[PDB]
């Protein structure tokens, strides 16, 4: 038997309030989760998640081939040399099932200082035609700030969990410079389902996406109700159960690094399932020059010998490595 992962449901609503003790009781749950399998579900979170899977379907269903080339990232369209991160990631019928749309900080405009300096990892979002996709851009931009809001709360929790003041992470997570991204991913139902789009793990499990750690501080994910994720433990992979009312939370490799691996970046993978579904991650990245001084919660003096890492450099290296390891998405 494949076993099932312990993924506690955590009411995060106090992290939005001023009851300091209640916040500590949340911090404690985040602590325990982070030291166990690495994942928890954030519940009672305040986001209208019914209004987000709805909009995402429509978009992926009604967007045409013409429009997808017009929006395509550099990997699909050589005319779009500036689109490395933001835009459309096409499927390849017969070969690749998955398709997606990535967007960045909406404050990234032509006269944003980092765009004018052409700093790596910063791009101006591309959007579909407003008449073919009415209200889509307004929706997506508002969603970014809703999820931004939630993540800030979560960070206050991770800060207190590690014995820090509640702004230790959050002070670096700002609307004006955050490198955070949203990805709207469609996993289609297909019949017949293409063999090239299915990978076989060392243990025989059929996968849509291979094992990895996330390139992030934390990952804040909504998914529709189809079980697919697995987390690696010493006893092997365990199933993460679906919950399409909550957010699935985990640490990325920036956290592992900062905490001297006290809070690991859990290794996980995506099982193949032939079912129509949505996966909407928000990757919680800091600013290009944000630096957190590493530390070691296991040591009485808290000291770590690890070098401080600037976030933009970590992010560039990480995104290139993911593609070289798990493929162009
Ligand atoms: C390694 C991960 S978490 C994948 N992420 C990327 O490929 C990075 C996207 C970065 C974005 N283009 C940007 O520029 O920020 C990803 O989102 O896939 C999710 C999924 O397959 O549902 C995931 C694998 C579930 O674990
Ligand atoms: Fe991941």
UniProtKB/Swiss-Prot annotation:
Gene Ontology cellular component list: cytosol
Keywords, ordered alphabetically: Antibiotic biosynthesis, Cytoplasm, Iron, Metal-binding, Oxidoreductase, Vitamin C
Outcome (variant: residue 281 to L): Abolishes the catalytic activity
Function, in words: Isopenicillin N synthase; part of the gene cluster that mediates the biosynthesis of penicillin, the world's most important antibiotic. IpnA catalyzes the cyclization of the tripeptide N-[(5S)-5-amino-5-carboxypentanoyl]-L-cysteinyl-D-valine (LLD-ACV or ACV) to form isopenicillin N (IPN) that contains the beta-lactam nucleus. The penicillin biosynthesis occurs via 3 enzymatic steps, the first corresponding to the production of the tripeptide N-[(5S)-5-amino-5-carboxypentanoyl]-L-cysteinyl-D-valine (LLD-ACV or ACV) by the NRPS acvA.
Effect of residue 229 to I/V: Strongly reduced the catalytic activity
Residues carrying the site annotation Transition state stabilizer: 209
Name of the protein this chain belongs to: Isopenicillin N synthase
Enzyme class: oxidoreductase
Species the sequence originates in: Emericella nidulans (strain FGSC A4 / ATCC 38163 / CBS 112.46 / NRRL 194 / M139)
Phenotypic consequence of residue 221 to I/V: Strongly reduced the catalytic activity
All residue ranges annotated as the Fe2OG dioxygenase domain in the record: 174-286
Annotated residues for binding of Fe(2+): 212, 214, 268
Binding site for 2-oxoglutarate: 277
Residues involved in isopenicillin N binding: 85, 89, 181, 187, 279
Residues where N-[(5S)-5-amino-5-carboxypentanoyl]-L-cysteinyl-D-valine binds: 85, 89, 181, 187, 212, 214, 279
Family (UniProt): Belongs to the iron/ascorbate-dependent oxidoreductase family.
Cofactor note: Binds 1 Fe(2+) ion per subunit.
Top-level division of the source organism's lineage: Eukaryota
GO MF annotation list: iron ion binding; isopenicillin-N synthase activity; L-ascorbic acid binding
Main location: cytoplasm
Enzyme Commission identifier(s): 1.21.3.1
Effect upon mutating residue 96 to E: Strongly reduced the catalytic activity
Quaternary structure (record): Monomer.
């Amino acid at each position: 038997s494949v076993s099932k992962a312990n993924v506690p449901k955590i009411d995060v609503s106090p992290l939005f309030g001023d009851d300091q003790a209640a916040k500590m009781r949340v911090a404690q749950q985040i602590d325990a989760a982070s030291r166990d399998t690495g994942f928890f579900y954030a519940v009672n979170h305040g986001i209208n998640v019914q209004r987000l899977s709805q909009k995402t379907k429509e978009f992926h269903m009604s967007i045409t081939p013409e429009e997808k080339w017009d929006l395509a990232i550099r990997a699909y369209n050589k005319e779009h040399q500036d689109q490395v991160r933001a835009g459309y990631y096409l499927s390849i019928p017969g070969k690749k099932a998955v398709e997606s749309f990535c967007y960045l900080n909406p404050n990234f405009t032509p006269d944003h200082p980092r765009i004018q300096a052409k700093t790596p990892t910063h791009e101006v979002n591309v959007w579909p035609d407003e008449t073919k996709h009415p209200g889509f851009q307004d929706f997506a931009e508002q969603y970014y700030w809703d999820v931004f809001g939630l993540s800030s709360a979560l960070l206050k929790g991770y800060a207190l969990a590690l014995g820090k003041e509640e702004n230790f992470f959050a002070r670096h997570f700002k609307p004006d410079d955050t490198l955070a991204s949203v990805v709207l991913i469609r996993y289609p139902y297909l019949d017949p389902y293409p063999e090239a789009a299915i990978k076989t793990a060392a243990d025989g499990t059929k996968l849509s996406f291979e094992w990895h750690e996330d390139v992030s501080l934390i990952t804040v994910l909504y998914q529709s109700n189809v079980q697919n994720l697995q987390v690696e433990t010493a006893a092997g992979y365990q199933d993460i159960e679906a919950d399409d009312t909550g957010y699935l939370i985990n640490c990325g490799s920036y956290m592992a690094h900062l905490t001297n691996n006290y809070y690991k970046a859990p290794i996980h993978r995506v099982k193949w399932v032939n079912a129509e579904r949505q996966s909407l991650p928000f990757f919680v990245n800091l600013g290009y020059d944000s630096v957190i001084d590493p530390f070691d919660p296991r040591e009485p003096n808290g000291k770590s010998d690890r070098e401080p890492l600037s976030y933009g450099d970590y992010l560039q290296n990480g995104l290139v490595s993911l593609i070289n390891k798990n493929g162009q998405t």
